[PDB]
Amino acid sequence: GYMLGS
Amino acid sequence: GYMLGS
Amino acid sequence: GYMLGS
Amino acid sequence: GYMLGS
Amino acid sequence: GYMLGS
Amino acid sequence: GYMLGS
Amino acid sequence: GYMLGS
């Protein structure tokens, strides 16, 4: 799984 | 932005 | 599954 | 900008 | 998969 | 995988 | 930005 943001 | 993968 | 937005 | 996944 | 371009 | 470009 | 992988 992955979670990311910018 | 943002991203979620599951 | 995936969720994302910008 | 771009967001993608597979 | 999925793709978003902005 | 996943990719985000900004 | 930020990233979490699991």
Place this chain on the structure above:
Amino acid sequence: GYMLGS
């Protein structure tokens, strides 16, 4: 900028 993972 960029963020990615596999």
